[PDB]
Write a protein that binds this ligand. Structure first.
Ligand SMILES: [Au+]
Ligand SMILES: [Au+]
Ligand SMILES: [Au+]
Ligand SMILES: [Au+]
Ligand SMILES: [Au+]
Ligand SMILES: [Au+]
Ligand SMILES: [Au+]
Ligand SMILES: [Au+]
Ligand SMILES: [Au+]
Ligand SMILES: [Au+]
Ligand code: NI
Ligand code: NI
Ligand code: NI
Ligand code: NI
Ligand SMILES: [O]
Ligand SMILES: [O]
Lengths: 564, 122, 100, 564, 100, 100
């Protein structure tokens, strides 16, 4: 008995060699391999396979290799590959990627992926499943920002802020022990993972370090607090001692130094360079040259992503919620040459990460959206990458999915917990209908329980009737919000008992291993090079070659989908 | 050129299910007056008592149909079905309580079947 | 008024439909959410008018055609479902493939 | 001094022999008796009776027979009668039904119903007061479902689910120890009473039983997990040992057996048969024959309730969010003959309970609504029941109110806490304006504090200006949500300290006494009989008599009330 | 805009009134919530126009008549109250028995 | 429809704008929130129509004039900003001093 491929894909999702369009882009991903045994696929419902004595084992207690949750027939898109598998979750972690079911009667069952009495089922056939997005440039300004992030597949917010205070409105900073404690307490009520950055400013160690001991997960150096040689140096000394990451928004004004001075203060130490293109801030006009250095982990914020006909005009008036000296400053800061080149640097693997800059100069719900728009524009302008085979865009898809999943997690020192669909990691997973991929998440799973879902009328006979909208689910309600989300904190704050001292009930994640990494550690985005930015023309060269691009008038993942 | 968002381009060819396992065709009768649908992965010898077939031929087997589909028998309907072999450990527990161990225990399975009045034990 | 939760939510659908209809009136090809709002509101207003489920299942296939919507939208919409109070109480209407 | 009856009823609500229309139905309930002393009625406001030295006692401390809350002049509709009384609440329980006030100066004051300094007042004159509704068929799929339930007078949700996972979308199941613990934690944030059902599937005892020990309050056998002889048998063995209820949705496909096989596996043990008519699921076509057996506690889900011109069409396409073999299956499953007969079986007391099937195939806010629509249709078609007197519908009203209050509570093993307005039970009470009765609750009281209310503009001088809508009240806010709601749990989980282990702060209710009951224990709905369902024609007979009914084109409690 | 909580809620009343008025325009007898929305929105728009409380108490008795609404609706509505910003600040309007 | 949080909120702006436009149609001078709603909704509808940011920055200065609004309102409104989905994705429009 044979099933043709069209019907097979309809019923169980696609299999090896089949391709799927991402939303309304011209990007195609291809199934590289499939962990199933054809004929023993798992599925759930009336007369289906996961029933007692059949695909569901009726013998084993939950401890005996039995899952709490199986996602059946998932098409995984991850830095580790694009492939078909069942995903098994237990104790809120991914424990198995393979083939779930009942070894009584099925071949090829992954030994710890038994469906038992204890097992819940999510049908992922026909869905794409990715890791939750990791946004490392978050301003905590308005709690309404969290659902915005969840609706576009983001599951971790790293940044700073105390609400709409001017310091927080400009900088990803929660300053000092007391503001940090207050925001750790606030975090207890936010249904997403969080890590908080202290103020990376000071000329003595202790005022900076006490923020790490109070429970910050990293530091932010921002020009608005003085991105001077001293603040840079003291922050990195703190970070090297505490094993946390420092993000920098450098001195746009070149007041105390030019880019070369900033790199000298850094002195070869690890640093995350925020909005490296520089519209979002940094040494005018050449900040983007940071992205060539081996000790720099470079990210883009999202409003420059990708380069479009309206980009410059929007950024021009945007820099007026701010305002001859003004015009010159604006012209030095908003540059078509660097924004254009930023598109290509993404495509080449020279800028490793995306991020939002949520509510300060970036969109909380558009990190994932704009990553794919950028990849699609690059395919349209540059063609398939050299590395591609089979007419698929798998190579570009792995390079781009890395920018908002694994690479920020590595940079921040949290990739042991989050950032990819791998065994041993926390079960932060996003299901997408391919037609909505990267636009509107179907279900966002946090620590193995659904936290957010596009779902319909709660008064209806079934959940599909209108209106279908993003809604918080049971993972966010009551005490379950504590078990399904992680507060990431410095090792010192954890060793000093800060969680017990503040009464935090959230899972506590340890920041670690982010002093001993560099550009080479950025998955699919590991390129070091000489970046030259001409001081007169702003022309960008990479090892002597000029990089120009042009803006597009239209993007996919835009007016087909959005009501406003 | 027309874009269907999220569409598949499936590869050419066909998927063979249950490849490499022995197949067996048998006749089965619904002697009952109500319809019976049988799922892909139920141990075939443990189906509804009122289905008449050679019960020995259902031991260690299930329907050779796509995972998650079902064969349908209207009241009084007799038809052929194709069976494939169970895999993994070839053990069955629960369901109708006829096996509760290795499917190799043919005589014990049929003895329980006959005692409880599953039709077609010789 | 005594609005219950569903009555409050469903006001939003009517509102989205009004917005979409103005967009259509000024000559725009409609997008995915606009199309869904128009057909959903049509169904709930139909139930309020006292039509049967059977009538609305037929009529819902003719509210918008492919020339009213952007490329790909017909294929994005496999079904539209809505529950509303008919003269005989709440019933579910499902319209399969509403736009060809 | 005499008051004519029209003015009396206006001022104090109706008294003995007076009748009240239920909403816009043709059902009339009659006051059977009245606990007042005419002239000493309690009431509150300027120059009214409950004032210090007068109807309010100024002497006694709260411990001295003084109430925390008096509902004045309530028209109670309950299985125990339809009558006029004051209702006194203390420590969150109903402590007195009788005559409240001040024994200093009033005759006939119930001794523990003193209005004192400690007493709050709710005016119930002109209201009908019932127990909160007990919905025993709840899928926990979308937290928005809770307010929907509260708005239609439901105060207890029994069922299962982890949110919009496919297992939960199909079955009232929270599977296994970990999913159960997570949902008990979630429950801490839900302003309604809850009990959780584990997966009633397995061929060994321990995988099932460990769910009860983890804190489940019962089990659900569902065909989608394999409603086989083994799963039925092991679940009932567990339930008999643990003293919890099992609900069943049987094998519609007749795969492993016909109805007689299911009854044999049950073997005379107690079971709750869900959606017994069978559109919602079960042995095709004869499942409804369950409702004749003495060991079966039979419930309907609500979409078949009652039989109307649109019923079949809606159910037909509803079973396509699912899809020759398909048509046959649908035709075997959606049957005008059984849905029609289901109306009459309700009226005869043969089906004992209503329930929703919320978000799986039933409406979270329509259990109470459809109970009364059904009673009204039956009066219109069958006439007043033989048992009626005085031109009232009191007998039918007690039979129908029982279906969503006391009978589910008895079936689930929780009637010692909830399900009726009796002394000693938890003060879950719903006030209704007669014009909105069974449609939109006025105030829902949970554990003696209002949890939900139809109330107007919060910025206004008074609470009646528009817009008047359902809103959560103070009982739902902060820690008070813990004291006003009950998590029902197995005796074993309680003895093993699960609440302390999970940090639950809700009142903990014990499930008990539900192995030693049957059909005879269903108040006003205790009829056992031979139900025959013809396998060819689907004609229903009860002790040899054919039962036919017909659909109606219009219902009360519909377009007069609802905005959509 | 600086919307406060009441301004956001009261947008809903206007919206329900618009919905009800379209229903009335297509010949339906109006139900309970529809009727309340129409009269409530009339009052708030009246205050916005600068009418007095006294005018709106009179006019509110003549916005809908019994022939505009379903059986029983007149008797269901004993009073309709609304607060709105008059030229002299927020005031409460109560219309007793608005539909005979 | 798959509404996200911003799509739900922004329905409110359209609704406020509809309310304000009816008020203007009956001859009222518009207040602060009414004026902001009208110009904001104009911008988002403009983006939906496919205009550029540059066009909407110009046109937004001519939607209402001082004679359309109450005393002081022009001076209360220094800027109006709105984000909407253009054919090339979300962009921010800021209109400085929209009413003189
Ligand atoms: Au700036
Ligand atoms: Au700025
Ligand atoms: Au300028
Ligand atoms: Au200028
Ligand atoms: Au900015
Ligand atoms: Au079904
Ligand atoms: Au279904
Ligand atoms: Au059909
Ligand atoms: Au058909
Ligand atoms: Au269904
Ligand atoms: Ni910055
Ligand atoms: Ni920033
Ligand atoms: Ni069911
Ligand atoms: Ni159900
Ligand atoms: O930034
Ligand atoms: O169900």
């Amino acid at each position: 008995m044979k099933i043709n491929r069209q019907q097979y894909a309809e019923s169980y999702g696609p299999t090896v060699g089949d391709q799927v369009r991402l939303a309304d882009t011209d990007l195609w991903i291809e199934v590289e391999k499939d962990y199933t045994t054809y004929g023993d696929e798992a599925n759930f419902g009336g007369g289906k396979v996961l029933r007692e004595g059949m695909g569901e084992n009726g013998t084993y207690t939950r401890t005996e290799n039995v899952l709490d949750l199986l996602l059946t027939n998932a098409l995984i898109l991850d830095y580790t590959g694009i492939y078909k598998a069942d995903i098994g979750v237990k104790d809120g972690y991914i424990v198995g990627i393979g083939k779930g079911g009942n070894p009584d009667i099925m071949d090829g069952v992954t030994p710890n992926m038994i469906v038992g009495t204890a097992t819940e089922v999510i049908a992922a056939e026909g869905k794409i499943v990715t890791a939750g997005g990791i946004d490392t440039h978050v301003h905590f300004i308005n709690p309404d920002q969290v659902d915005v992030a969840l609706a576009n597949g983001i599951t971790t917010l790293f940044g700073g802020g105390t609400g709409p205070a001017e310091g927080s409105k400009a900088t990803t900073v929660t300053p000092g022990p007391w503001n940090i404690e207050k925001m750790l307490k606030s975090t207890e009520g936010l249904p997403i993972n969080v890590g908080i950055l202290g103020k990376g400013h000071g000329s003595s160690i202790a005022p900076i370090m006490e923020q790490i001991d109070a429970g910050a997960a990293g530091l932010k150096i921002h020009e608005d607090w003085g991105a001077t040689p001293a603040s840079i140096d003291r922050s990195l000394t703190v970070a090297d001692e505490a094993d946390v990451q420092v993000a920098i928004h450098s001195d746009t004004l070149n007041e105390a130094g030019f880019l070369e001075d900033t790199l000298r203060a850094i002195n070869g130490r690890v640093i995350h360079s925020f909005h490296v293109e520089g519209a979002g801030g940094g040494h005018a006009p050449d900040i983007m040259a940071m992205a060539g250095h081996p000790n720099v982990l470079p990210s883009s914020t999202n409003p420059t992503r990708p380069f479009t006909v309206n980009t410059i005009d929007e950024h021009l008036d945007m820099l007026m919620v701010c305002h001859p000296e003004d015009v010159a400053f604006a012209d030095s800061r908003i540059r078509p040459e660097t924004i254009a080149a930023e598109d290509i640097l993404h495509d080449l693997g020279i800028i490793s990460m995306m991020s939002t800059d949520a509510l300060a100069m970036g969109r909380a719900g558009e990190m994932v959206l704009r990553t794919w728009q950028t990849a699609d524009k690059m395919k349209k302008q540059r063609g398939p990458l050299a590395e591609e085979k089979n007419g698929s865009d798998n190579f570009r898809a792995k390079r781009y999915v890395s920018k908002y999943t694994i690479n920020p997690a590595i940079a921040q020192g949290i990739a042991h917990e989050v950032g990819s669909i791998e065994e041993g990691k926390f079960a932060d997973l996003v299901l997408w209908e391919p037609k909505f991929f990267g636009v509107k998440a179907d279900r966002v799973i946090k620590g193995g329980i659904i936290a957010y879902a596009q779902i319909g009328d709660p008064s209806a006979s079934i959940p599909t009737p209108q209106p279908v909208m993003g809604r918080r689910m049971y993972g966010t309600v009551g005490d379950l919000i504590h078990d399904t989300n992680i507060t990431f904190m410095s090792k010192s704050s954890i060793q000093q008992g800060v969680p017990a001292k503040l009464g935090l009930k959230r899972r506590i994640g340890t920041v670690k291993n982010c002093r001993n990494i560099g550009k080479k550690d950025m998955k699919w985005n590991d390129v070091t090079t000489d970046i030259d930015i001409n001081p007169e023309t702003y022309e960008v060269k990479v090892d002597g070659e000029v990089l120009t691009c042009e803006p597009v008038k239209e993007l996919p993942m835009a007016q087909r989908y959005f009501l406003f | 050129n027309y874009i269907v968002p999220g569409e598949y381009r499936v590869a050419e060819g066909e998927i063979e299910i249950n490849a490499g396992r022995e197949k067996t065709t048998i006749r089965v009768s619904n002697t009952g007056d109500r319809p019976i649908q049988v799922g892909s992965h139920i141990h075939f010898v443990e189906v509804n008592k009122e289905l008449l077939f050679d019960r020995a031929e259902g031991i260690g087997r299930r329907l050779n149909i796509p995972s998650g589909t079902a064969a349908r028998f209207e009241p009084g309907e007799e038809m052929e079905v194709e069976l494939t072999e169970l895999g993994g450990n070839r053990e069955v527990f629960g369901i109708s309580d006829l096996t509760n161990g290795s499917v190799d225990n043919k005589e014990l399975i049929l003895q329980r079947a006959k005692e409880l009045g599953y039709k077609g034990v010789e | 008024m005594h609005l219950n939760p569903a009555e409050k939510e469903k006001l939003q659908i009517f509102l989205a439909s009004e917005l979409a209809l103005k967009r259509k009136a000024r000559g725009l090809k409609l997008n995915y959410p606009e199309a869904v709002a128009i057909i959903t509101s049509f169904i709930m207003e139909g139930a309020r008018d006292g039509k049967t489920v059977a009538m609305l299942m037929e009529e819902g296939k003719h509210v918008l055609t492919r020339d009213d919507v952007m490329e790909g939208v017909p294929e994005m919409i496999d079904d539209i479902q809505a529950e509303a109070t008919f003269p005989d109480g709440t019933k579910l209407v499902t319209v399969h493939n509403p736009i060809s």
